[PDB]
Amino acid sequence: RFVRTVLPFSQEFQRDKQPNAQPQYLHGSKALNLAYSSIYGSYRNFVGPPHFQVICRLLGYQGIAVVMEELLKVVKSL
């Protein structure tokens, strides 16, 4: 598993937090939104096999290829 570094090395950058839409456009209701955000709260404190599993599906062969190719370029540059 991967975890976040210590405070002085934590490179923060401002995120444009999205305006909240109506519950029907998310999980369905306020109760369900709260329930599901709690469910997925567990996954925010690390990066591991479940995250990698999801990344794999959502990117497919083409997404993985381009990410690998680009990571190689980051490494070449560094």
Binding site: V66, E70, K73, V74, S77, L78
Partner: peptide, 25 residues
């Protein structure tokens, strides 16, 4: 619309980089 907009405010007040070319794209 205006009546509800100025009812939410009524309740709110009386309460409280050059390494990868893909990055550019």
């Amino acid at each position: 619309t205006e009546d509800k907009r100025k009812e939410k405010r009524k309740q709110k007040q009386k309460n409280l980089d050059a390494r990868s070319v893909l990055l550019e794209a």
